C-alpha cells in the first residue's frame, strides 16, 4: 500500500507517509500571470544540451523516465536564476486520462493535456542524492503539452512505450536529442518549490516556460497506454499521474519577460 494516483493512495494520502507534502514550499502551483513580477535582472537560460548522451528507458510504475549519462557536464543548464551549473539526469511525463488534464502546473487555472520535466542537479553537489538534500540543488524546467500538430523529435519516444509497457521494464534508449522537445522561445517563470512525487524535497528551483509545444492526439494516446501495475498484475491504465496545485504561502512567482 505503497503512493500513487488512485483513490486510496492518491495525493490526498501522502502526506501520511511525506509529512512534507504540507510543507511551505510545494510544487506544483497554479501561475497567475497577473500577480507575477517580471524581474528584469533575470539572465536569460542557456541550455546546452549538445553533448547529451540518452541510455535508458524505463517505467518506474509512476511515469517513464528517459535516464541520461550525468557523469560529466554533457548536457547542462545555466543562467536564468540559476547559480553554478546543473547537469540533466532525466526527464518524464505527466499526462491526463482525458486531453483537458495532465499538467501538474496550471496557467491563469488553465490545465494543459500534459507536463514535460528535464530535471537537473546542482554540480557543486557533487551527485544527485546529495544535491536533492539541498535547497537549490535542483533545477526543473518544466514544459507544457497541448494537443495540435505533431511533435516529429517526440516520435522516437513514443514508438518504444510498447518495450517498457509495464513497471520494472527499462530498455536501451540511446542517440536521443531533448533539443527537438523545446519551444521556440525560452521565456519563463521561476520560483522556489519542490518534487512533484514523494519524497516531495523541497529543493526545487521551478524554471517553467511560457510557450507550449504541440504534440498530435496520437502522440499524447500512446502515453496512455501505459500501465501502472507490473507484468502479471491487474491492468491499471497509467493516465492522471499528476498532483493537483498546491497553496503558493509566502513565495512570488518572477518571469523573465513581460
Ligand atoms: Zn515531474
Not at 527499462?170 to 533539443?179: V, W
Request: proline letters at 7%; aromatic letters at 10%.
Amino acid at each position: 500500500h505503497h503512493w500513487g494516483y488512485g483513490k486510496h493512495n492518491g495525493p490526498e494520502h501522502w502526506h501520511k507517509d511525506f509529512p512534507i507534502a504540507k510543507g511551505e514550499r510545494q510544487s506544483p502551483v497554479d501561475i497567475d500571470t497577473h500577480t507575477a513580477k517580471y524581474d528584469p535582472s533575470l539572465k536569460p537560460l542557456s541550455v546546452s544540451y549538445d553533448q547529451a548522451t540518452s541510455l535508458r528507458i524505463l517505467n518506474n510504475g509512476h511515469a517513464f523516465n528517459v535516464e541520461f549519462d550525468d557523469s560529466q557536464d554533457k548536457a547542462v543548464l545555466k543562467g536564468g536564476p540559476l547559480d553554478g551549473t546543473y547537469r540533466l539526469i532525466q526527464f518524464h511525463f505527466h499526462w491526463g486520462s482525458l486531453d483537458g488534464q495532465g499538467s501538474e502546473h496550471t496557467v491563469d487555472k488553465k490545465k494543459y493535456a500534459a507536463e514535460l520535466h528535464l530535471v537537473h542537479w546542482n554540480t557543486k553537489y557533487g551527485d544527485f542524492g546529495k544535491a536533492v538534500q539541498q535547497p537549490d540543488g535542483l533545477a526543473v524546467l518544466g514544459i507544457f503539452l497541448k494537443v495540435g500538430s505533431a511533435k516529429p523529435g517526440l516520435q522516437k519516444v513514443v514508438d518504444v512505450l510498447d518495450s517498457i509497457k509495464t513497471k520494472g521494464k527499462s530498455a536501451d534508449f540511446t542517440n536521443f536529442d531533448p533539443r527537438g522537445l523545446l519551444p521556440e522561445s525560452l521565456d519563463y517563470w521561476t520560483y522556489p518549490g519542490s518534487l512533484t512525487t514523494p519524497p516531495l524535497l523541497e529543493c526545487v528551483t521551478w524554471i517553467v516556460l511560457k510557450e507550449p509545444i504541440s504534440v498530435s492526439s496520437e502522440q499524447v494516446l500512446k502515453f496512455r497506454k501505459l500501465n501502472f501495475n507490473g507484468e502479471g498484475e491487474p491492468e491499471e491504465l497509467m493516465v492522471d499521474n499528476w498532483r493537483p496545485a498546491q497553496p503558493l504561502k509566502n513565495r512570488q512567482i518572477k518571469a523573465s519577460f513581460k
